[PDB]
Design a protein around this ligand. Structure first.
Ligand SMILES: NC(=O)c1ccc[n+]([C@@H]2O[C@H](COP(=O)([O-])OP(=O)(O)OC[C@H]3O[C@@H](n4cnc5c(N)ncnc54)[C@H](OP(=O)(O)O)[C@@H]3O)[C@@H](O)[C@H]2O)c1
Ligand SMILES: NC(=O)c1ccc[n+]([C@@H]2O[C@H](COP(=O)([O-])OP(=O)(O)OC[C@H]3O[C@@H](n4cnc5c(N)ncnc54)[C@H](OP(=O)(O)O)[C@@H]3O)[C@@H](O)[C@H]2O)c1
Ligand SMILES: CN(Cc1cnc2nc(N)nc(N)c2n1)c1ccc(C(=O)N[C@@H](CCC(=O)O)C(=O)O)cc1
Ligand SMILES: CN(Cc1cnc2nc(N)nc(N)c2n1)c1ccc(C(=O)N[C@@H](CCC(=O)O)C(=O)O)cc1
Ligand SMILES: O=c1ccn([C@H]2C[C@H](O)[C@@H](COP(=O)(O)O)O2)c(=O)[nH]1
Ligand SMILES: O=c1ccn([C@H]2C[C@H](O)[C@@H](COP(=O)(O)O)O2)c(=O)[nH]1
Ligand SMILES: [Cl-]
Ligand SMILES: [Cl-]
Ligand SMILES: [Cl-]
Ligand SMILES: [Cl-]
Ligand SMILES: [Cl-]
Ligand SMILES: [Cl-]
Lengths: 505, 505
């Protein structure tokens, strides 16, 4: 007992008050107008249906959204009025109206069902409230539905940065008399705020069954994800240009040598790959495992994480000359080296308190006292210990760096499978940083990822081409439901990763 | 004794028969023509003087070129004839005429002085012969002076790649009747062979004191050095965008976090920076020092290398809590960790044979037997040894990789001074690779350089701006005058770095 690493008092100076990411639904005329002062000028029933369906429907199979798992819509006061009483409140969804004249009760009235909440501030507060401990597991996607004033805030920092998709219905009607305006800025413009907007989908031109045979079309717009895209263009480069190589088993690979990647961890954005679902539950579970200096791999198994299972079998241990290790015991691997570098190993049950160099601790120590130190790095690559290990480490090195009170972290990895190894490990180090940040009272900055031998497996090739066809969506956020007294005492339950919107596992 | 690493038998399969790099002098009309069949059409006396001076004059101060240190000109047979007997042979220079009809003696005739050599092949053989053990220290720059046939070979692989500068005199004369042609290809064209040609200098338009008041101008053309340029654009990025930081002494720095560089080591090209002269003699001396697992820093001092001098003083050792170490003893630093990782240190004189993990050896071992291994990496970052060291390592990690029978090598460095640290270290690892290549019977490939904290010192800033004004020239070549029985037994004398053409120290 301690020995452990003790967490600081408050959250990091000028810190991220946990927000929620959102999506925006809007209809415009060709000029980009939304409603002549109050309300809306045109009448397209097809938009209404398309509105209903976007706002209601959850991810997955035919899963009716009960209060226990549902979607939420955010609107200003004027719009909430604008909705006809026959469809008020909006069914299936959590009507969220911001107001500074009316309260939650003050709005409830025909009668009488509690699917609404009024909020005292703007969009930020909504997102804060929606990301708040109870609302978060229950509420899947947030949608902003208008109007002008609410949209203004959406395309303004720091909302615009939490803005993750725009569904935009264009109406082929035209007059000048429509007052307010909504234009998505072109990329690389001042108004763009450095965001790059792309078409993800776009419907046919369609004609409305209303009174004027008026044309309309749909389109989904997403904020281009350079970060994830660099990962992909590395995969493509390997496939096109990699050297054919053959590993220890004998499987064929394509590999390149030496590359570098970066990912913003700012405001707990978390680079889980969109183009393919990552095993976050395992990621998180394994790293906390690492952080304790753990070794008995069945701790992971017991918790439904089966990866060290292959390398933990009686067979493989023996195949690696580890007679004396009981099944699922790995020796001085990763985390052990992290916390007790150079400590002589015997078995996993054995007490390792005080033996060997506790790198992580000393790092946490230096960070707080002396941020400018060019020596804050831990290693798992111990030549003397390597033979006693079930597996030499891939991610063998990490160096920390601090600027503008933000913590960055370079990770070095000698052998990198883009297939799953890599995306997994990116998430893994992203978490470490965020945690270490939290432990040293700093905001998180960048993860820099340096790859040694980067490879794709011979089987993986064609699969990977399927992945390369997809566009990367925006990244999710790590948010803490709870904090702990000691870093070591953190658990998967304590955090929850919000707004992860991938494509199939 | 051995213990050591034993060198292989022959040189690496399909290997670089040591060549010399050269420069090209040529005159053209505006159409790019050089001489109507045999000889030259126009008469410009100013070209002749400019020819004389380029071909004769050595680098440095008023140093008359004696046979002991001089310049060499390479010409085909027809040109050697073309020279009028009153200036034959060309004075101050080693007239080198290739022929397959006439020999060295066969050409000597008025009479009678031995400043010439005939060669049986083309330009390659010339360069080979000029880089040959005796001719190399003595002969400073090689110039190719024509004609058509010799120029053809110059702009052809693999000469064009050893081609390092073109001095081109343009004559503002015009007819069609000039037969042969000389055009430098535009960059990114087929004919360019992937080389990018740039103007380094260009004179005034000038009028010849000959019979027709004919115009002419000069210009120097160099093959753009992307490689070195990446180093520079990193320096500029730091200066423009680096975070102000303050190191352990207290000096001010500008730093960035995490970057990556590459350098071709192919055919023993050696990335010594042109934009500022590097201390090669020290580089080479220190790395061989490393390679032996050496520690008594005075071995370097004795050999006129004073860098470990500051960190080796009685003072600094004491300042680092090293009472027991005699002056100029550093503890388990760099090379020691390389050769005896984890060996318990006592003093430099003490025998360390057989103790600790000999990384380098095992690497050399694996390379030969199993090139596809993703584990060939040595480290100097030993947490248990760090406190006993006078200095923690900057270059703490190197991983090797083999493709197409070429050896590449990634180097990881945690703290990087662009001022001198970096350029020095690039050369340092380039040498290691070349040597390790030689030890494992492989050709050398790429050095990949990964920088952690990259910085420029507060003083260094303005100096560095002066450097940034320069254009990087082409890189030099490492060539071996002699080989050794064991890797350890190599010496600075054994090799000689040819064609290093910088700007002031
Ligand atoms: N074409 C389309 O798809 C599109 C979409 C939606 C709506 N529209 C239309 O366009 C019109 C635009 O009008 P609008 O923008 O004024 O509508 P609105 O968004 O519904 O009205 C904003 C109201 O929300 C509350 N609010 C906003 N920010 C707040 C804050 N920071 N703190 C506390 N309360 C806050 C305020 O009510 P309190 O007075 O109570 O404080 C405020 O009056 C709407 O009437 C709508 O019908 C068009
Ligand atoms: N404008 C300018 O600045 C410029 C510069 C220089 C010259 N020029 C003129 O342009 C003309 C071009 O004619 P050119 O190109 O035929 O002249 P050249 O280069 O002097 O003649 C080539 C001769 O060199 C020997 N040689 C070349 N390659 C060889 C090889 N691979 N192995 C053995 N021997 C080799 C051959 O002599 P063997 O028969 O003995 O084998 C061959 O005939 C010259 O006459 C010159 O006056 C113009
Ligand atoms: C005034 N208002 C806001 C409104 C209207 N059209 C939009 N159209 C688009 N594309 N995006 C929006 N932001 C949007 N917002 C309204 C008006 C009617 C209903 C409405 O009838 N609600 C039903 C629609 C059912 C139906 O008519 O089919 C629902 O279930 O959502 C809601 C919001
Ligand atoms: C035919 N030939 C080859 C020749 C002539 N002009 C050139 N001009 C240029 N720019 N580049 C060359 N390749 C070149 N080559 C010649 C002709 C004369 C002399 C010559 O008179 N040599 C004296 C020149 C002394 C003088 O005339 O001032 C010397 O010292 O180099 C040499 C080479
Ligand atoms: O965290 C990990 C663990 C394993 N691997 C994969 C990639 C390589 O194929 C292999 C590395 O093991 P060796 O090649 O050195 O045996 O494991 C990773 O990419 N990341
Ligand atoms: O091979 C070397 C040796 C030293 N340094 C310089 C750069 C840093 O300023 C300093 C590293 O030492 P610390 O900052 O960790 O004390 O030494 C290098 O760049 N390369
Ligand atoms: Cl329906
Ligand atoms: Cl009102
Ligand atoms: Cl067992
Ligand atoms: Cl003169
Ligand atoms: Cl002839
Ligand atoms: Cl002493």
């Amino acid at each position: 007992s301690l020995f452990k690493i003790r967490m600081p008092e408050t959250v990091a100076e000028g810190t991220r008050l946990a927000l929620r990411a959102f999506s925006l639904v809007v209809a415009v005329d060709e000029r980009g107008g939304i409603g002549d002062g109050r309300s809306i000028p045109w009448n397209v029933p097809e938009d209404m249906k398309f509105f209903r369906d976007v706002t209601t429907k959850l991810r997955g199979k035919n899963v009716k959204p009960s209060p226990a798992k549902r979607n939420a819509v955010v609107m200003g006061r004027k719009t909430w009025d604008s909705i006809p009483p026959k469809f008020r409140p909006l069914p299936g969804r959590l009507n969220v109206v911001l107001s500074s004249t009316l309260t939650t009760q003050h709005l409830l009235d025909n009668l009488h069902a509690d699917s609404i909440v009024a909020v005292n501030g703007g969009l930020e507060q909504a997102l804060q409230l929606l990301a708040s401990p109870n609302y978060t597991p229950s509420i899947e996607t947030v949608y902003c539905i208008g109007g002008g004033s609410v949209y203004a805030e959406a395309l303004r920092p720091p909302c615009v940065h939490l803005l993750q998709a725009i569904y935009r219905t264009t109406i082929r009607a035209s007059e000048s008399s429509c007052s307010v305006f909504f234009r998505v800025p072109e990329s690389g413009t001042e108004a763009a705020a450095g965001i790059e907007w792309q078409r993800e989908t776009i419907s046919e031109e369609l004609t409305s069954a209303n009174g004027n045979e008026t044309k309309y079309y749909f389109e989904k717009l997403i904020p281009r994800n350079r970060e994830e895209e660099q990962y992909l263009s590395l995969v493509d480069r390997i496939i096109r240009e990699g050297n054919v190589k053959h590993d220890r088993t004998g499987v064929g690979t394509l590999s390149i040598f030496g590359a570098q990647m970066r990912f913003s961890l700012r405001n707990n954005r978390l680079p889980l790959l969109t183009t393919k679902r990552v095993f976050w539950r395992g990621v998180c579970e394994e790293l906390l495992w690492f952080l304790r200096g753990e070794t008995y791999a069945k701790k992971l198994s017991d918790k439904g994480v089966h990866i060290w299972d292959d390398n933990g079998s009686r067979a493989f241990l023996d195949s690696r000359g580890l007679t004396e290790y009981e099944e699922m015991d790995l020796g001085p691997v990763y985390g052990f080296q992290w916390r007790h570098f150079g400590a002589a190993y015997t078995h996993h049950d054995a007490n390792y308190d005080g033996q060997g160099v506790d790198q992580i601790k000393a790092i946490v120590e230096t960070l707080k006292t002396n941020p400018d130190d060019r020596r804050m790095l831990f290693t798992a690559w111990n030549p003397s210990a390597l033979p006693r290990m079930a597996l030499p480490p891939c991610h063998l090195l990490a160096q920390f760096y601090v600027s503008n009170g933000e913590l960055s972290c370079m990770l070095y990895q000698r052998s990198c499978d883009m297939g799953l190894g890599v995306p997994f490990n990116i998430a893994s180090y992203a978490l470490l940083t965020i945690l270490i940040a939290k432990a040293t009272g700093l905001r998180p900055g960048e993860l820099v990822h340096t790859l040694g031998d980067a490879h794709v497996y011979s089987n993986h090739v064609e699969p990977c081409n399927e992945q390369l066809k997809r566009v990367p969506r925006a990244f999710p956020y790590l948010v803490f439901r709870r904090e702990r007294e000691f870093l070591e005492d953190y658990e998967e339950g304590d955090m929850e990763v919000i707004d992860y919107a991938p494509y199939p596992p």
